[PDB]
């Protein structure tokens, strides 16, 4: 068992541009709080349009033809990525601590889950860097045609606050493995580990201007990036509200390519032939992981009538024994919520559903006086048209619905806006096959949930060369 | 030898939805004209926001789960693409006539290039519908993970007038071969070729609603497809301004996937080593093929100062010799411009040149009254400053710019700020190597020009499926 | 329903070189029989080493650099293969009739599975011909490396007699797809289907010498190409024995590329949660389809202890009811065995098993004379030690073994020295999971009975260009 | 500049089986010489059939189903491969020195060329291990088909002495990356860099049995491998003579998969338009690198007539100023050849071409009295008839030919039996284009001298699941 970093000093708090730590152009600065105690952890250089323009200029310069980063061998990009999964490794405890501190998630999970995933990621695109292959194509006539992949250029990426450092690797690592330069805004709530990565980037020795980290707010720094004239790709993750704005601010900007990963509903189909103890434990980790603040995990759980009663009973025993406490105490399964705005929105929703005929089985009220702690709450007899069902609840709220027929539960889970991931627990292989093909989802988990190379195409563009040849042959 | 269809009737002028020819929901029609004779050729059922909805409902029910088009073997998706290639090949004389009248391209050229592209396209992608493979990924843990490539769904497509039937085949075939359903709006200028395809689609026996043709205007039918909420992806070719509009129309409603084929300059660098007989020719056909209406060809021609006067000589000779005249005269090389508004913006830009310093060496005015015929024109002594070299001309104008060194050209050619294509004519291998990698082009052509798999990647969606397995074993 | 061709003149009997029908350099011919009647159906030119030469030279000049078939667009090669499927779709009845009379499969099966397969193979491979893609690779330094997939060249193919026409198509589509050239020799038992193809191959119009059909014998002509100095690859399918000689015959001759398709056991595993209606029949059509003679199925059946006797019950009920007769009878499910040597080696083994403690549940002997018809037999209570469960039975013999636990049924299946396909029947997703991994099986079919054939007909060419300065 | 390890103690002289160092079962021993001086460096435990059967049981066991190496995550096999390049990097100077001493490579050459490549190779497949992907295939009907690539199993690998370590890296990394186990036999000349790698392989912590290293001889250890019954795939590299033997010694023995990396002819083609100062040197380094001892020593240099004289004039000056010396002296470009057999094989071939009309412009005899050094030789006026031009040299002899036209030289150059590799030196892009295609080569370089290494250590397992109703 590892131990949290004692008396942690937030060394790194300035803006990261051209591998220099720089003050804000205004001098302005904003505070970062501790969701467990509501206290303030420190203050960091806010970034605005002026501050963004700096970072863009740096990242364009580091992308120019004669540049170190541009001239490097692909395998030497994979080396640098691999050196940073080394530095992440030796500092695993501090990056897991500063996650625990900034982000309220239990320090043991932040170590064995989050940081773990940051390192494997970096290692994995480390290996991809020099295995990104174009093709050669037979073309009617005396021609030879072939295809290079090449970096797109300056990418600005905006990440939410659910998984601050994991989002960070998830986005840096493909971007760099393809040879791009980067301008990343971590959420305003959780910039801290992001900034610590900046020193680790200098330390593994990426060329300057290749990774630039600007902490600050959606309206200021975020909107700066989303509309900047000198950024080629923007990749954003968060609320479908703010997502809409990015896409329009990008066709009225420079037509920059745009990636949007937005939340979705995550239905959770449990047929009766499943191991009830397994499923009650998986569906409880599938809703209660990272205190429900999991953009990859959901809350709509469809239990088959046969096992509906017993399931609820099992799940409510799980929540009632589910330790909520200080993130740094190693027996805590569930930390606070990220901030008060989130805390309120979930309560307002719990009391919403309690006022539409949902049987509150437990929870449904805050925990402490200080912090943002919410009792793990379970709801029963949720109908499709309850508000609580139509809108995903980004906290520790388990909503158990009922179903009796397979095609029923399929059309129900199916109906949905854009965005949807599905999870089924069955042993009938025919049941798994029909359902997983029928779900209009992009990810489907047969008997599990979790938090690759398709991520690479979306950081490169295809250049096509065709040469005329004297006499074509087989 | 092949001769235009005589007494050609325009049998197909209604709206194509659900494999029924249909009238406007408003009763209204719109004119279509013969750019050669200026004469109105017929009148077509104009489409608007409600016609669009008709075809979106068609195209959403035919993509539904039980659907014939969904159950179909992917191998049979390709059989229909081959049966349609059959029909096109059968009616290759009628199609090339229709394209030549309503579009203005010479008939022989519509028969031996355009139409040859159409048929080759459908046979190509008939071969792909079988071969769209997903992948199996090894993952850490006791898990089995694979991907499926599944159709995106209802695809609104908006093609222009440059190559009416070709652009129709280049957009429709990849989306079909991936299992999609289409709402395609052909140019208001040139919709007769695409309406006649509906009749061949019915005869090949696509399930109704799997393709729907809606002729109309950009502002009515164009934007109607762009904002319509039951269209999962939109694919547009044409003006850079219209496309920025679409990207906003698409963020504001539905957040659809959006694809913008948008024009640009196409620098031609003809280094001195080249074979001048070939280069004067390949650079003359690159400019005047399809009378200048080419978003897959260019107007800037860069010649090394060594061979400048000899080049502008041989160029003006070929442009003096170049044969204008009716599309059906089998001696015509260049036909008319598509309609008056273009014909006028081309002469506008010719007079722009003469009043800024261009050495007009040939042509520069209209030919007569009949139709929209413009003389073949060659400019000279052009700089990058001039407004004829900073904005592209969509007509039969050949401008020729000077250069001296090679790193000189590589800079001047990249200066669009946006995405283009390049061409290079060299016997030296390292020039060819150097310039082709130095270009910011989507495609480079070495010792040629021209008017695959990678169009396919944009017409399906990846689904992932991780199964929990009872033990991992290599 | 479709009907066999009434007047089946076997027009095509000569050897095929350079798209010319030719006679034996020796003049010698050989017989071709009808296993339904034991009657003799015609006499076909017998091929030997001197016929294999000329044939190898045909293909050699058809593949030489400045050639039509070489300079061709790959897409045209696609068009050619695609035209072939047309003619086979046209003469479907003809070629199902000729396949039924000569090889003895029921003509309805010939028309609806074999010919189904052939036509689809040529179409699938018409579609590959022009999508065979190479590779640009990032390489340290100022360089630029790419890859071309290029044909191998002259390819000797040696196909068996189980699915004569299908096997002919499975072996020729990919090779010609990649732009190879073929000297194929079909089983002496069944040259007839293949010599017809030669007509259509010309009618569609492949360049002369791009395909070359060779009728004759394994030792006479099969070794002629197996050891032939001017052949680049050899493509054998047959017994585990005859291939070992091919593999050695190569190492001593040319260092040809050698692929060997060799028959192996197909164990079925029917756990007791399986649909017994489906299982007893799907494992009855895996054992008895094509009169047992299957290089894509097998005879060992492992049924769970709980569902054991009820299985073999429903199975003997299916094998008694299984109609046997003339292949042209729209009722016949099983036709004859391929020849008398085959006939005997079957009955020899069915007498082997009765003599070893295997309850002969059904069948066991012949049917009548003038033809090679064996009763559908069923064995129960077959151990692993019995010589009929150790050795392949190439006939209508369904032996059923017992098993009590899953790790037990998985240990018995894998026990086989060479290749193997396995077929599982279970609704337990996790049982399916473990069995299909644990099998050391090439193919695994859960609840039933492409490109990786393309990569065998091409070699890789790699070109690195030195460049002036490298940039992303 | 780095400095060779001083007074290197060859510490690792024993067989490597099961991550334990063992003596030979017979207890026999063989010696290892220094090709620069001819003095024996040390002795090594000789491996034979007895030893190979320990090796093959240890690796078959490492491959068993519940083994560490099999339940390991793919990405972990890549982690292991990454520690091994780490350790090679840590020991770059001892491995380079072992190589310089055992194999006679100039020490800086081992250090910046060979060891660079060992390390990069291990790093590169270290990234491949968990990116080895299968397929999901659309299939006619209510079905779901997909592909998983899986290790073949125990692979016995045999390597030459040209590039002892480099050939070890290149052979083992792709094998390991796919999750196999190995039985590798270094050349008897040059086991030493290999046997050290056993210590490194134990260090990084590969499970036992996954890598067993047997030093000894072709007829004993190597033959005991190719024929073994417990080996699933034989991977040989060297003379096409022993090559042929191993393909036959693997027909007569479990029909195991064979891979043969045998020498071949490597023509150079210098067109007049090229940069003569580049071309003369890249052609010089193409011949004399590693003392002519390349897998395909680029022996034939066709030079277009217009530059022919001036090319050979500058060539002879380059060969005359080439420093043949002690491998440990940092000014050395050319070392000794591997042993006397190779040595006088070369002297006899030089005496051949002199006796047939080739104008020996420099070189032709040995160097000192001790060791196996040979003057860098260069021949003029060589013709395709001469034996030295028809048969491959494995040493420092450059043979320069004339040519007139492009199609002449193209026709001349791919006039090889089997293998060929080609290099063109030209600025004419069309010439480069036509030559590189019309070359019957497998690798073609323009203006100079991976995953196509993976599929070969996997096999595709196919699974087809029946589904209730397929939608797209």
UniProtKB/Swiss-Prot annotation, chains A, B:
It holds the Pfam family Aldedh. NAD(+) binds at residues 159-161, 185-188, 239-241, 341-345, 392. One of its GO terms (cellular component) is cytosol. The modification Phosphoserine is found at residue 326. Keywords: Cytoplasm, Disease variant, Lipid metabolism, NAD, Oxidoreductase, Phosphoprotein. It is found in: Cytoplasm. The record marks 162 as: Transition state stabilizer. It catalyses: retinal + NAD(+) + H2O = retinoate + NADH + 2 H(+); all-trans-retinal + NAD(+) + H2O = all-trans-retinoate + NADH + 2 H(+); all-trans-13,14-dihydroretinal + NAD(+) + H2O = all-trans-13,14-dihydroretinoate + NADH + 2 H(+). The gene is ALDH1A2. The keyword Iron does not apply. Homotetramer. GO terms for molecular function: 3-chloroallyl aldehyde dehydrogenase activity; aldehyde dehydrogenase (NAD+) activity; retinal binding; retinal dehydrogenase activity. This is Retinal dehydrogenase 2. The modification Phosphotyrosine is found at residue 143. Its EC number is 1.2.1.36. CDD domains: ALDH_F1AB_F2_RALDH1 (cd07141). The active site is at residues 261, 295. GO terms for biological process: 9-cis-retinoic acid biosynthetic process; anterior/posterior pattern specification; blood vessel development; cardiac muscle tissue development; cell population proliferation; cellular response to retinoic acid; determination of bilateral symmetry; embryonic camera-type eye development. It comes from the Eukaryota.
Curated annotation (Swiss-Prot), chains C, D:
Pathway: Cofactor metabolism; retinol metabolism. It is an enzyme of class 1 (oxidoreductase). NAD(+) binds at residues 159-161, 185-188, 239-241, 341-345, 392. The active site is at 261 (proton acceptor), 295 (nucleophile). GO terms for molecular function: 3-chloroallyl aldehyde dehydrogenase activity; aldehyde dehydrogenase (NAD+) activity; retinal binding; retinal dehydrogenase activity. Gene3D superfamilies: Aldehyde Dehydrogenase, Chain A, domain 1, Aldehyde Dehydrogenase, Chain A, domain 2. Keywords: Cytoplasm, Disease variant, Lipid metabolism, NAD, Oxidoreductase, Phosphoprotein. It catalyses: retinal + NAD(+) + H2O = retinoate + NADH + 2 H(+); all-trans-retinal + NAD(+) + H2O = all-trans-retinoate + NADH + 2 H(+); all-trans-13,14-dihydroretinal + NAD(+) + H2O = all-trans-13,14-dihydroretinoate + NADH + 2 H(+). GO terms for cellular component: cytoplasm; cytosol; perinuclear region of cytoplasm. It is found in: Cytoplasm. Its EC number is 1.2.1.36. The modification Phosphotyrosine is found at residue 143. Its main location: cytoplasm. One of its GO terms (biological process) is neural tube development. Changing residue 157 to K: In DIH4; decreased retinoic acid biosynthetic process. It comes from the Eukaryota. InterPro entries: Ald_DH/histidinol_DH (IPR016161), Ald_DH_C (IPR016163), Ald_DH_CS_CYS (IPR016160), Ald_DH_CS_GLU (IPR029510), Ald_DH_N (IPR016162), Aldehyde_DH_dom (IPR015590). The modification Phosphoserine is found at residue 326. The record marks 162 as: Transition state stabilizer. Catalyzes the NAD-dependent oxidation of aldehyde substrates, such as all-trans-retinal and all-trans-13,14-dihydroretinal, to their corresponding carboxylic acids, all-trans-retinoate and all-trans-13,14-dihydroretinoate, respectively. Retinoate signaling is critical for the transcriptional control of many genes, for instance it is crucial for initiation of meiosis in both male and female. Recognizes retinal as substrate, both in its free form and when bound to cellular retinol-binding protein. Belongs to the aldehyde dehydrogenase family. Homotetramer. It is linked to Diaphragmatic hernia 4, with cardiovascular defects: An autosomal recessive form of congenital diaphragmatic hernia, a posterolateral defect of the diaphragm, generally located on the left side, that permits the herniation of abdominal viscera into the thorax. The lungs are hypoplastic and have abnormal vessels that cause respiratory insufficiency and persistent pulmonary hypertension with high mortality. About one third of cases have cardiovascular malformations and lesser proportions have skeletal, neural, genitourinary, gastrointestinal or other defects. This is Retinal dehydrogenase 2. It comes from Homo sapiens.
């Amino acid at each position: 068992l590892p131990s949290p970093t004692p008396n942690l000093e937030i060394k790194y708090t300035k803006i990261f541009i051209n591998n220099e730590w720089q003050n804000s152009e205004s001098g302005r600065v904003f505070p970062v709080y501790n969701p467990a105690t509501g206290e303030q952890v420190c203050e960091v250089q806010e970034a605005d349009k002026a501050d963004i323009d700096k970072a863009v200029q740096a990242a364009r310069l580091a992308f120019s033809l004669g540049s170190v980063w541009r001239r490097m061998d692909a395998s030497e990009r994979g080396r640098l990525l691999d050196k940073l999964a080394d530095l992440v490794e030796r500092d695993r405890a501090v990056l897991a601590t500063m996650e625990s501190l900034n982000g309220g998630k239990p320090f043991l999970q932040a170590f064995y889950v989050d940081l773990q995933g940051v390192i494997k990621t970096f290692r994995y695109y480390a290996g991809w860097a020099d295995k990104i292959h174009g093709m050669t194509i037979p073309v009617d006539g005396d021609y030879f045609t072939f295809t290079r992949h090449e970096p797109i250029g300056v990418c600005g990426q905006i990440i939410p606050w659910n998984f601050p450092l994991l989002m960070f690797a998830w986005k840096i690592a493909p971007a760099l493995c393809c040879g791009n330069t980067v301008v990343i805004k971590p959420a305003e709530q959780t910039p801290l580990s992001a900034l610590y990565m900046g020193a680790l980037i200098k330390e593994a020795g990426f060329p300057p201007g290749v990774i630039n980290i600007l902490p600050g707010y959606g309206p200021t720094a975020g909107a700066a990036i989303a509309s900047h004239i000198g950024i080629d790709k923007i990749a954003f993750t968060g609320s479908t509200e703010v997502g809409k704005l990015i896409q329009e601010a990008a066709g009225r900007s420079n037509l920059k390519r745009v990636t949007l990963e937005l939340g979705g509903k995550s239905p959770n189909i449990i047929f009766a032939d499943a191991d009830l103890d397994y499923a009650v434990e998986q569906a409880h980790q599938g809703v209660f992981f990272n205190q429900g603040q999991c953009c990859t995990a959901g809350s709509r759980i469809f239990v088959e009538e046969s096992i509906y009663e017993e399931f609820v009973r099992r799940s409510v025993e799980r929540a009632k024994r589910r330790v909520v406490g200080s993130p740094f105490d190693p027996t805590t399964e569930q930390g606070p919520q990220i901030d008060k705005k989130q805390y309120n929105k979930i309560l307002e929703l719990i009391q919403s559903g309690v006022a539409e005929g949902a049987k509150l089985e437990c929870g449904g009220k805050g925990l402490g006086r200080k912090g943002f702690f919410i009792e793990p709450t379970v709801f029963s007899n949720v109908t499709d048209d309850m508000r609580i069902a139509k809108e995903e609840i980004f906290g520790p709220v388990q909503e158990i619905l009922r179903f009796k027929t397979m095609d029923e539960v399929i059309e129900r889970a199916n109906n949905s806006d854009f965005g949807l991931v599905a999870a089924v627990f069955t042993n009938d292989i025919n049941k798994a096959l029909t359902v997983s093909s029928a779900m209009q989802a992009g990810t489907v988990w047969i008997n599990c949930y979790n938090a690759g190379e398709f991520g690479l195409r979306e950081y490169s563009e295809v250049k096509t060369v065709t040469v005329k040849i004297p006499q074509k042959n087989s």
